[PDB]
Structures are given as C-alpha cells and as structure tokens.
Symmetry: none
Subunit: 128 residues, 2 copies
Amino acid sequence: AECKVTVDSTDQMSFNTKDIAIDKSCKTFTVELTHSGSLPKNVMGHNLVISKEADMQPIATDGLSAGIDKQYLKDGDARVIAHTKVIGAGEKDSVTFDVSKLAAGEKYGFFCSFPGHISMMKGTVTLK
Amino acid sequence: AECKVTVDSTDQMSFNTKDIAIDKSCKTFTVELTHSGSLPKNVMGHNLVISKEADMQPIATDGLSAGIDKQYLKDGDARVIAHTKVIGAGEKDSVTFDVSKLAAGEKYGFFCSFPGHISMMKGTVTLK
Ligand SMILES: [Cu+2]
Ligand SMILES: [Cu+2]
Ligand SMILES: [Zn+2]
Ligand SMILES: [Zn+2]
Ligand SMILES: [Zn+2]
Ligand SMILES: [Zn+2]
C-alpha cells in the first residue's frame, strides 16, 4: 500500500488538495505538510488537523485561545486524531498516526486551525 | 486644518503609509481605508485600528476570538480609540473620532487586527 501523502499550503490561505485518500490496508498513515511562499508562521502559519467532520469547527474555536505555542490546539483535545505543528514559509512537518483510529462509516475531515483559516482551509478524508 | 487622510491596504498585506499625522488643532479626525487588489475579506481582509502603541498586540490577540463579524475586536475593548470595519477588495470604510482622546506625550499607533496581519501592517500616529 501507499501510506503517505504530502499536502502543500500557501500564502493565499489554501491547501493544494481538498481530499486526502487513506488506504484502509495501511497500518499507519503519514501526512507531510509543506508551506510554499514567503510568509512566516505568525502571519500566515498553517497546520493540518484531522478530526470528525462535525468536530472541526469546535476544535478550531477551542484552539484560538491556545496560541501558536500549542499549535493553535487545546492541549489534550480528545477530538483531534492527528495534527502537524503550525509551520511558516519554507518549513515542513509530518505526522504519523494509526489508521485504526478512523472508524469506518464515520465522516472525517482535515483543516487548518490557525485563527480564521478554517473557512478556506478544510477538506475531506476518504478511506479507500 | 486638514483633518482627514486616506490609507490604502493591499493583497500584499500592507498599508500604503507607515505614519498618520494628525493636526492637534483638529476637533475630529477622519481616517478612510480602502482595499485595492482582488482578494475577498475572508482571505485578505483589513481594518485599521488606532490605540496606544503598547496596546496594539494585546488588542489584536483579544480580537482573535471575536471573529470577522465583530471586526476582529473584542466588544467594548476600552483600549481601542477608533477603528474601521474589516473590508475586502474594492470596499472602503471610514471612521471619525475626537482628537481629544489622544494625549500629547503618549505614543499611539495604527494596525490591522485581522489574524496574523499586525506584524506586517502597523505604523505610528504622530500629532502635529
Ligand atoms: Cu492555515
Ligand atoms: Cu490586514
Ligand atoms: Zn471546548
Ligand atoms: Zn498535539
Ligand atoms: Zn495645528
Ligand atoms: Zn467598535
């Protein structure tokens, strides 16, 4: 199986994809996030966070007050299945998680939790 | 006296001035803000906020939770002297305030409180 994907994020507040396909055959899956462009992380930082589709906005709202030091995520948030750091231009991060965590028949999505980015920066996770 | 100034804001996350000079003789001062370029407000929205220089970042941090519907400013934040709405490309807005609110000898600045913009979008307010 192919159990890795790389997603780019930009100065114009977008990801380069709207769906991440995860082979159910995979034991673990690795998401690598890169940031093209020139803006630093405190201006236009992006992370990639995976959760239940219905949990994305609640997580993002709870992340606002956490600050960039905690990757704009509330510490110990149980709704977060996996997430990268907040990265700025020229940086990259990756996260590897157990594919078992994704309940078949449940709807999953990815988003950026930097304040206000979720409106433009989200997508679906599809198990294949 | 001249008691009005126009400031433009860009897709490049910049104001087209670094200083706003306010004549002390003015009873009121009016700041008009425009937005050139083509990006919508949820991507590259800008407002213009006036406060004490030391207060700019705390105000901006507090504004994160207020959201774009509240112009990214906490309601009733007493540290805010004056502010425009958040505007997107092709829009404009203006604010008029009493110049007596400026204490000569105190240092004032202007900035944009849209998430992440402040480090790239701020300047001084100079009384003349
Ligand atoms: Cu982002
Ligand atoms: Cu701005
Ligand atoms: Zn909560
Ligand atoms: Zn974490
Ligand atoms: Zn004068
Ligand atoms: Zn107000």
